[PDB]
Design an enzyme around this catalytic site. Sequence first.
Site, short mmCIF file in Angstrom:
data_model
loop_
_atom_site.label_atom_id
_atom_site.label_comp_id
_atom_site.label_asym_id
_atom_site.label_seq_id
_atom_site.Cartn_x
_atom_site.Cartn_y
_atom_site.Cartn_z
N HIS A 68 0.85 -1.21 0.00
CA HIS A 68 0.00 0.00 0.00
C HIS A 68 0.87 1.25 0.00
CE1 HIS A 68 -3.20 -2.81 1.34
NE2 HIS A 68 -3.93 -2.02 0.57
N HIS A 72 1.87 1.54 -5.58
CA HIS A 72 0.44 1.13 -5.67
C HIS A 72 -0.40 2.30 -6.17
CE1 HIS A 72 -3.45 -0.66 -4.83
NE2 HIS A 72 -3.74 0.33 -4.00
N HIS A 106 -5.82 7.56 -3.22
CA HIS A 106 -6.86 6.70 -2.59
C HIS A 106 -6.32 5.94 -1.39
CE1 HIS A 106 -5.14 3.16 -4.65
NE2 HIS A 106 -5.90 2.40 -3.86
N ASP A 107 -5.01 5.84 -1.22
CA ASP A 107 -4.43 5.07 -0.08
C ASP A 107 -3.45 5.94 0.72
OD1 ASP A 107 -5.66 2.49 0.34
OD2 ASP A 107 -4.59 1.68 -1.42
N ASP A 217 -8.22 -0.51 -8.40
CA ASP A 217 -7.55 -0.80 -7.11
C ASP A 217 -7.05 -2.23 -7.17
OD1 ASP A 217 -6.53 -0.48 -4.53
OD2 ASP A 217 -8.49 -0.60 -3.58
N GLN A 269 -6.10 -17.40 -3.21
CA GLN A 269 -6.16 -16.63 -4.48
C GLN A 269 -7.38 -17.07 -5.31
OE1 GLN A 269 -4.25 -13.79 -5.27
NE2 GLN A 269 -4.05 -14.20 -3.10
C1 LIG Z 1 -6.20 -5.46 0.50
C2 LIG Z 1 -6.58 -5.26 -0.97
C3 LIG Z 1 -7.71 -6.23 -1.30
N1 LIG Z 1 -7.16 -7.44 -1.93
C4 LIG Z 1 -6.31 -7.32 -2.98
O1 LIG Z 1 -6.00 -6.21 -3.43
C5 LIG Z 1 -5.75 -8.55 -3.60
C6 LIG Z 1 -5.79 -9.88 -3.11
C7 LIG Z 1 -6.43 -10.46 -1.93
O2 LIG Z 1 -7.17 -9.75 -1.26
O3 LIG Z 1 -6.26 -11.79 -1.66
C8 LIG Z 1 -7.00 -12.37 -0.51
C9 LIG Z 1 -6.83 -13.89 -0.16
C10 LIG Z 1 -5.14 -10.68 -4.05
N2 LIG Z 1 -4.68 -9.92 -5.01
N3 LIG Z 1 -5.07 -8.58 -4.77
C11 LIG Z 1 -4.72 -7.46 -5.66
MG LIG Z 2 -7.30 1.25 0.37
ZN LIG Z 3 -5.49 0.65 -2.95
#
Ligand SMILES: CCCNC(=O)c1c(C(=O)OCC)cnn1C
Ligand SMILES: [Mg+2]
Ligand SMILES: [Zn+2]
EC number: 3.1.4.17
Length: 313
Positions: A68, A72, A106-107, A217, A269
Amino acid sequence: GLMQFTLPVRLCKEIELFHFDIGPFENMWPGIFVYMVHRSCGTSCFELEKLCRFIMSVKKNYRRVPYHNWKHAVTVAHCMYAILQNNHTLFTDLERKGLLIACLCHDLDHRGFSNSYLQKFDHPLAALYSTSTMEQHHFSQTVSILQLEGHNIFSTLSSSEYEQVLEIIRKAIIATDLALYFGNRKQLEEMYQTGSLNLNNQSHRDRVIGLMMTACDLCSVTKLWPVTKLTANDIYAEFWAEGDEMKKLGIQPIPMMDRDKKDEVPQGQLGFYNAVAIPCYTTLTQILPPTEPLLKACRDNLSQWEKVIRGEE
Ligand SMILES: CCCNC(=O)c1c(C(=O)OCC)cnn1C
Ligand SMILES: [Mg+2]
Ligand SMILES: [Zn+2]
């Protein structure tokens, strides 16, 4: 005024593609961001001097966290840049301005932790904002940097244009809250299949922009396999740090965040691609058919994660 930003040929060409990776040279990312603003919006829409100072205050207010981070922020703005360029006529001069700044911002000031961890920690931000905790903070940090002397990149908007753009940026940033995504994409799904979706209906535009934000995002899942795979490491570095902090508060974390359960990542995943990513890019493609490459790249990476489980890597 007559100052353009030019990129090396390969960047000049690859930047227009959804799957573009902004590379490992940090000192190039601002130029890349300006290049995107100038081609997406005009060389006019911001005073270069004021933009360049905003970009560096924004960079400075992202932290050194594995995922983050500043990289990003720019990756997520790039994905919005590809969407806006493949859907030229659908968006107003102001939306194009607002969304690129929304994505960069955004972050802001992320500490590498979920809204959940703050609530269990009882972090002061969980007192000031009960929902979308980090996301209310991110917009709040945005408005603070806009208020710095020589940082109002919007100075030359009319008064009412100013309030419109800060409203686009607030809804845009809040929408990157994944707890809100599920509802927002359900309502967009139903509105496109009962055929009631209307891009002139402000509350409908809001939802569509919101899905765009979720799609940008998440866009590391839409890159070529090796980029997506290496980004997954950074994402899990934050998740396992958070799991370690959950244990420190005497709570057993969800397995996603448990570094002992490193074995179950590939299955985690699949869950995320099935439950979130594929549904997200699918509904996006339906509303904005030129965003299909994101769907196609996501499905390919769904395929690649299956091959990891099947022991084929
Ligand atoms: C915290 C952001 C929300 N998640 C993600 O951005 C994400 C994941 C995930 O959340 O995996 C969860 C098992 C897997 N690839 N990406 C881009
Ligand atoms: Mg965020
Ligand atoms: Zn983000």
